Structures are given as C-alpha cells and as structure tokens.
C-alpha cells in the first residue's frame, strides 16, 4: 500500500528481538520490501516468529557479548540495524539485580550491537533504529528500570546520531504507545489515547521502513512517536 | 523512489505557503503521488511556484479570513491540509504590531485553516500537517515572534490531535532544521554546520518526503507527533 | 518560613493578573520579602485581590497598550516582572476572534510588558517570570488557544532569555499544575487526582514560593528554565 | 543571603559524591542551613572535601552494594538524599565494560541509594534530589554512556516521583549546565551560553536547598535547568 516493492532489495537488515511482537513485524516489513533480514531473539522458531523466505531466524541471547560479536563478524554486509529487543519485570525491577538485568538488555546490548554494526554500516552508509517508549517521557512507578532504560535509549540514539553522522549512518528511534503484542488500567490507557485503541505491531513497522530508507535522508537523532496521541492527552 | 505512485490518487490536498520553498516541494510531492493539490500563497505564479498539471496555483493572503473561508467552501473534497505558510521579520518582531503580524500568519491562520478544513477532512478522515521549527525547541533572540509562534503551532498540533481524533483526522508536525530555500553569512553558515551532525543544509524535498509519510496510511497510529527533519541539529 | 525577610527589600515588582489567584499570591510573597509590588489586573479591589501596605492595586486591562506603556513610564524603578495574567474561554476558543483574544492577553501582552519592563530591568539587572501551564506540554482539545498560547509563552521565555542575558535579565517560567484558584466536576477532579502523584490540588502560595526562588539571587545561573510546580502531574 | 539560617535544623542529609565539586557545595549548603550531612565519596578527606562541624566525611565506593546498605542501616534518621555521584570516561565509553561502569555508578547506585533511603525518608516524609545534565537532552558523541546514564536518571526521577509520592517523598532533579568544578570547545560552550560564563557549584547548591525544602512542597518529578540558558540557544 505505501512503499514500492523492492526499495530494500539487495540490503541486509538485522533486527534484535525479531522473534515476536514489534520485532517480528519489523522483520516482516523489511523482508516484504526486498531486504534479507536476520531476526535475532529468544525462542527464534516459536509461534510468533516471522516466516518468510528472506528472513533467517536465529536463536541468540544478545547479552552474550562474545556470541553477538561472532555473529556480526560473520555478516558479509549490513545496511540497517534495529535494536528492538526489550524486557520489563514490572515491580521486581525494585530489586537491584533485576533492575540491572533490564538495563543490560534494554540499553547495554543496544550499545554493543550498534558498535558491532558500525563498521558494516559505514561501508555504504546505512541506519540504526532504536525502540523507545512512552516511558522515555513519563515515569513508571511499576517499572522504574524499564523507564530508566528507555530514557537512556533516547539519549543513546541522540549520542550515536552525533558520532556516526561522519560515516553516513543515521540513528533514530520510534517511541511506540501501547501496542497490542487489568480492566481499570485498560480503561485509563484508552481514555488517554486520542485514537482510543491499541497500536498494532505493523504500524510501528511501517514507521521503521520509512525512517531507515532514503525518504528520511535528513532525519537523524529523531524520536518518532507512534502512539495514537497518548503523549498529548 | 520510496512511495507507491498512487498512494494519494483521487485525494485532494491543500498546501498553504505552496508558492515557494518547502510548501512548493510538499505540493509537488503530493501531486507526484496522485493527489490533486491546491497551492495557496503570495506571488502564486512566481519563479519558485510549483508547476504540475495536478497543482492549482492560487494567489491568496490567508490572513484574509473571509476569502479563505470562500475558498474552502468551494472545495468539494479535502483529504490533507498542510499549514506551511510561515514568516519571520527578525528583529522587527520586537515591535508589537509586527510581533502580532507574525503570530497572525504563523498561528492564527493555521487555526482558521484547520477549522475550515475540518468538516471536509471528517468526511473520510484525513490529516493535518503543520510546519514547526528548531525554534519550537530553542529560543531565538533575533526572532521572538517566530519562536513563540512555532511553540504555539506545536501545542496547537497536540490540541487539535486530541480534538480531531474522534473524526479520524490525524494532526502532526514536522520540525525542519535548516533547509536551503531561496546563507551568504559565512559565520552563520559555519555555526549552523558545526551544530548539524549531517554537516549540510537540508533540501525542501527531504521535508516533503516526511510529509508524504506522515499524511498517509503507513502513519495510521501517528497523531500529535512532531518529527524532526533536521540533520541531527536538535541533538548537538 | 524558607526565605530571609529582606531578600527583596528596596526592590520593585510588578505582577500582571495580580488581582486574584496565583498572581495575588505571588504579589503577597514578594511583598512579604520586602518588595514594593504593583498588582495589575481587572477588578483590582475585588474580594480576591491582595491586601498589604506594600502592594499597590491597579485596575488595568493590559491589552490597552498605550495605558500599559504610560504605567511603565511612570515607574522610577523595576527589578522583577511577573507575566501572570492569563485567560481561557474553553471551547469558545474554536471561534477565531476568541482564539485571538486569548492569544492577545496570554502572549502578546506578556511580550509588550517584557519590552516595556526591559529598560528598567536592565538598570541593575533583574528578572522576568512567565506563567506557563501543563498545556505547554499536553494539548487541550477543550482549549486550543490556551494551549497554543502557553506553548508560545515557553518559547517566548526561552527567546527573551537569550536576548536579555547580556543585560543581566534572567527570564524563566513556572508551569503550574492544577492549582485551586477561585472543581465541582466530580469526574474531572477524579481524573486529575488519579494523574497527580501528590493526589491533591496545588495551592497558590506554592507557586508563589517557587517564584520567589527563581527571581532571587539563589537562581543567578537559572535562565530560560521552566520549573514544573505540579504535584508530579507531568510524570504520570 | 537567600535562605533562613536554620531551615534544615535537626534534619539529616546524605550526599553521594560529597567529596568534591557539586556534591561538596551541596553538602556545605545543607550544613550551613542547619542539617547534619554525610558527605559520601572517594578521597573523602582530600583537598576538595567539605569541612564543617555538621558534615561527616565518609570514604565509600557506592558501587559496593553491601557496604552502602550497611551505611544506610546504621543511619538513625534521613530527611534528604542527594544522588550526586557521577563519572564520565569520555571516548573510552565506547568500550562496553567502561560503558557499563559509567551506568553502574551514574544510574544503578542512585537506584539502590534511593531504595535504601526510602524507609527512612518515609518516616516523616522527605526528598530525593538527583543530578542530571545537559546531556539528558543533547546527545554526546564523546560520552555516550554519560549521556545515556543522564537520560536514564531523568526517567528514574520521574518514576520514583510517582512511586514514592504516597510516602510523602518528593523526587526531583537539577540539570546543571557547564559547571566549573580545549580552547575551541570552551569558545563553543561560551558562545552557546546566554549568560556567557561557567556555572558555579554553589549555584547548583542553592537550587538543591530550595527543591528539598518546604517552599517546593508541590514540586515533584521536576527537572530544573541550572545552565545559564545553554538549553535555549
Ligand atoms: N508492546 C508495547 O506496547 C511497547 C510499547 C513501547 C515500547 N515497546 C518496545 O518494543 C520492543 C519490543 O517489544 P514487544 O512489545 O514486541 O515485546 P515482545 O515480548 O513481544 O518481544 C520481545 C522480543 O525481545 C526478545 N528478547 C528478550 N530478551 C532477549 C535477549 N536476552 N536476547 C535476545 N532477544 C531477547 C524476545 O525474544 C522477543 O523477540 C521492546 O524494546 C519494547 O520495550 C513496546
Ligand atoms: N527554511 C527553513 O530552513 C525552515 C526551517 C524550519 C521551518 N521552516 C518553516 O517552513 C515553512 C515554509 O517556509 P520556507 O522556508 O519554505 O519559506 P518561504 O519564504 O520560501 O515560503 C513562504 C511561503 O508562505 C507564503 N506566505 C507568506 N505570507 C503569506 C500570507 N499572508 N498568505 C498566504 N501565504 C503566505 C509565501 O507566499 C510562501 O509561499 C514556514 O512555516 C517556515 O517557518 C522553514
Ligand atoms: N489555576 C490553575 O490551575 C493554573 C494552572 C496552570 C497555569 N495557570 C496560569 O496562571 C495564571 C493565573 O491564573 P489564575 O488561575 O490565578 O486565574 P484567575 O482567573 O484567578 O486570575 C486571572 C488574573 O488575570 C487577570 N486578567 C485577566 N484578563 C486581564 C486583562 N485583560 N488585563 C489585565 N489583567 C487581566 C485577572 O484580573 C486576574 O487577576 C494564568 O496565566 C493561568 O493560565 C493557572
Ligand atoms: N561539572 C559539570 O559541569 C556538570 C554538569 C552537569 C552535570 N554534572 C553532574 O554533577 C555531579 C557531580 O559532578 P562534579 O562536576 O562535581 O564532578 P567531580 O568529579 O568534582 O565530583 C564527583 C564526585 O563523585 C564521587 N564519586 C565518583 N565515583 C564514585 C564511587 N564509585 N563511589 C562514591 N563516590 C564516587 C567523587 O569521589 C566525587 O566526590 C555528577 O553527577 C555530574 O554528572 C556536572
């Protein structure tokens, strides 16, 4: 409907957390537009993992730094990196070990992946897309580590945008709203969302396809809200 | 070479400030993608005005409220409104009458256009795109009215996003960085370039491509948003 | 019981919208701390107007530009300007004339007052304090002109902070949350309270204490800033 | 000049990174207004450490979680916690171990300190003050971990503001500009600062004394810029 069929033909994309939810939809969207895609994640062949002849599914815990490095070293080419893998442990995040676990996946692994991707992305130029959150803006009483990590990922986006510009690598983020991947909480969220519905994973994916392509040639360091207006209400 | 050719086939777009610069490029981008476009502005047939068989060029000062209303009433259909018209009078903006002139075009005319567009946009749903500025974020000593007006246009974007959502009218903004629209100030260029990670001027079609995305079906869950198209300027 | 009694002894403060609510509390707070204060507003001697021997109450519609200028010209001295006057007409703000009325008071009058104050504030340095809003951040479907005006006042704050810094005039804003100024809407109260971490209305003197800090020598490196005094509302 | 002499009389304050720079000035400011203060940091008796009869100087690496916990357990009372300790390793932050070191001190230790302080602060109510940065807003090519950590600390501030409100604990941050604690870089910074000078440590301290006191009773989740206008230019 929106993009020309082969706009990423001949390109290589790697999506962390590609094995379900938003990552799976992003992987599918790039594959559908001609890219070869590596969908990295846990339970890489599970029910929610994306099936497509141009998507290779790979089981990998990206906090395993050495294993991640080997994977990147084996890649002959990379045009786009999507740092999508993210977790929350809700109120268990008040436990320090758990807080640190959440940061390590949500932030530190994204930093490492970006640095491992960097020499490949510099070959022809390319892009990085990080996934932020409403909690990059609002605080969360129930998930302090998640909120902290998402504030961090926005500043990492802006910092790597500055650093990688000279290598023609653009670095952006999407801040999704409540994406369908407690009656009272649902009602609260829906009342505060102008569009009054859940966001859908493919809607984040369509934004990803735009931000990582040549129509966004002057876009770097940006955070695009894909949230049905939630931030505004 | 990003979008399918007919995304906007059968649709009607109206771009204020369509007679030069960013507005002209936005008008051309929508026309390219199949839309009929009305390009409203001053000097509507000037050298910088967009030429295309699907672009109607119309001379209209949009601060003329009655004339603007008549134009909108004559439209049988409208799918997208782009509130792009904007001016600055630099340090003359310290004069109150001039300050108010800048606000009247940059903000009040955008409010009026949005309200005149609303019943048409509500028919099938549609979108509004406002043009913000780096000065929606940073202050400007040399153009206080411009900066004020662009902070206003961002809150207007968010407010109308809330109001118009129930009519399926999405309302977003682009905050362009420094776009080469007809710079001779060597020192200013150097200052801007030092603060722009991509180290160049933006081009009007680069703003236009973002407009084509935000106003289309790939942005169905995007409303109230401000997208920076600025080469990283906000980050440095 | 926070500030020393004479921090503003020998100084002159002018508060627009000083005749009720937040403005009245700000005027009282500066008067408490030794300042002579002019409280400008409508119904200047009404029930909500601040009574104090160091507060002169003056009836003045600040959209009357010539009258405002005469008042400022009569002042022998000015150290602090508080642009607090603000109005909303809720959904009547969809009417353009009303939209412009709200902008004219909330933004343009603040610009004029700032410029009239400027030569006096430049004598020894001094400060300007603007009053923003939660709707400088969030949009408001029910008051688009109010929200637009408050986004504008934040960018005006930042712009004049840049412009006036070389004259040692600091320019800041407070963004108050929901302040109990004379609520009967049970549903609205419940919505606001659910989103306020401190789970209560703010009180006018609580905004006033922040004003006393921002405009004083403990805030010597604070300019262009917006301080939220909102019980956490922006965070929830 | 600004505050009444005994406004924090009888109260207990703990400042992390209290042994130099901004932390030292904050410690002095609270002590001068009547508080008993623990100034925790490295080189706790060094030249820059604050000397005052109401300031106890304590040598403690706050990444030593067990030692920090013991210190908090020994406190009979706490009214204000200032999470001021912060580091940067500049471009060495591109090394993952170093990136993680910076996060661990700048963010995780602040989370732990806040949680250890929480039961004491809940006794009578009280406040937490975190120290943010210009790089909570702007990215930094030369210090990505620092910028990430400071984006994180702003979201942690907002998250703990939401969580701790019911216990009458207010949680705020100051975003200092360039504080005097490369000719070309100096010139750039000074040209972009409207007040055209360095900020001074006591100027951050005066803001701290306001935010943690009863004149800021309705202020929580706030970030106050103390930056000479830098953010605006
Ligand atoms: N769902 C929402 O409403 C929402 C809102 C805002 C932001 N986000 C962000 O979107 C991203 C994806 O979330 P989702 O909603 O699709 O969740 P999800 O749980 O459906 O998917 C998470 C993905 O991350 C992967 N993952 C987790 N730990 C991993 C590890 N150690 N190594 C490798 N992969 C790992 C999972 O295997 C999975 O593929 C996250 O960063 C999340 O914070 C989601
Ligand atoms: N050029 C930049 O770098 C830049 C950066 C950020 C934002 N912007 C914004 O982009 C928008 C377009 O600016 P541009 O750079 O293309 O400038 P431009 O001067 O080339 O375009 C101005 C357009 O607005 C029209 N206009 C002016 N007054 C009008 C009136 N009274 N009635 C109707 N139309 C009127 C003009 O005729 C013209 O078509 C403005 O809103 C501007 O603030 C521009
Ligand atoms: N009440 C809140 O919860 C709240 C929240 C955020 C911001 N604010 C802002 O605080 C400020 C004060 O509002 P308030 O709640 O105290 O309201 P209020 O209605 O009690 O005060 C309005 C004041 O402005 C004056 N005013 C109105 N029109 C004027 C004119 N033409 N000329 C001169 N003075 C005029 C009034 O006479 C009065 O003194 C406003 O800027 C408002 O937007 C209020
Ligand atoms: N100086 C500036 O311009 C500036 C600007 C913005 C933010 N900040 C922030 O202000 C805070 C203080 O910085 P400063 O400029 O005073 O720096 P500084 O180096 O003078 O002081 C840092 C303090 O943190 C302590 N510290 C470091 N590692 C520690 C550990 N493991 N355990 C305990 N204490 C430790 C040090 O011993 C010292 O007391 C930091 O959070 C910094 O990011 C400073």
TrEMBL record, chains B, C:
Extract the Pfam families matched here.
Answer: adh_short_C2
Under InterPro entries, the record lists: NAD(P)-bd_dom_sf (IPR036291), Sc_DH/Rdtase_CS (IPR020904), SDR_fam (IPR002347)
Put simply, this protein is called: Probable short-chain dehydrogenase
Question: Does the keyword DNA damage feature in the UniProt annotation?
Answer: no
Signal peptide residues on this chain, from the entry's feature table? none
Q: Which organism is it from?
A: Pseudomonas aeruginosa (strain ATCC 15692 / DSM 22644 / CIP 104116 / JCM 14847 / LMG 12228 / 1C / PRS 101 / PAO1)
Output the Gene3D superfamilies linked to this UniProt entry. NAD(P)-binding Rossmann-like Domain (3.40.50.720)
- Binding-site residues for NAD(+), renumbered to this chain: 19-20, 22, 42, 61-62, 84, 146, 150, 179, 181
Please give a single GO biological process term from the UniProt record. Answer: fatty acid elongation
Molecular function in Gene Ontology: nucleotide binding; oxidoreductase activity, acting on the CH-OH group of donors, NAD or NADP as acceptor
Q: Which SUPFAM superfamilies match?
A: NAD(P)-binding Rossmann-fold domains
Q: In which family does this protein belong, per the annotation?
A: Belongs to the short-chain dehydrogenases/reductases (SDR) family.
What domain of life?
Answer: Bacteria
> Keywords assigned by UniProt?
Nucleotide-binding
Q: Which PROSITE patterns match?
A: ADH_SHORT
């Amino acid at each position: 409907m929106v993009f020309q069929h082969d706009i990423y033909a001949g390109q290589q994309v790697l999506v962390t957390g590609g094995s379900s939810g938003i990552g799976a939809a992003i992987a599918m969207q790039f594959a559908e537009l001609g890219a070869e895609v590596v969908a990295l994640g846990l339970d890489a062949d599970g029910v929610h993992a994306p099936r497509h002849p141009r998507i290779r599914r790979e089981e990998l815990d990206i906090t395993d730094s050495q294993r991640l490095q080997r994977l990147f070293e084996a890649l002959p080419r990379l045009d786009v990196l999507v740092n999508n893998a993210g977790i929350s442990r809700d109120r268990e995040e008040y436990d320090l070990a758990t807080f640190e676990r959440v940061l390590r996946l949500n932030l530190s692994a994204a930093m490492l992946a970006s640095q491992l991707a960097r020499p490949l992305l510099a070959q022809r130029g390319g892009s990085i897309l990080n996934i932020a959150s409403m909690y990059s803006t609002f605080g969360s009483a129930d998930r302090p580590a998640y909120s902290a990590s998402k504030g961090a990922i926005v500043q990492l986006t802006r910092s790597l945008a500055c650093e990688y510009a000279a290598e023609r690598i653009r670095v952006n983020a999407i801040a999704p709203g409540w994406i369908d991947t407690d009656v009272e909480a649902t009602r609260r969220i829906m009342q505060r969302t102008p569009l009054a519905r859940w966001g859908e994973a493919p809607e984040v994916a369509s934004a990803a396809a735009f931000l990582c392509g040549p129509g966004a040639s002057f876009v770097t360091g940006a955070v695009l809200a894909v949230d049905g207006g939630y931030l505004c209400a």
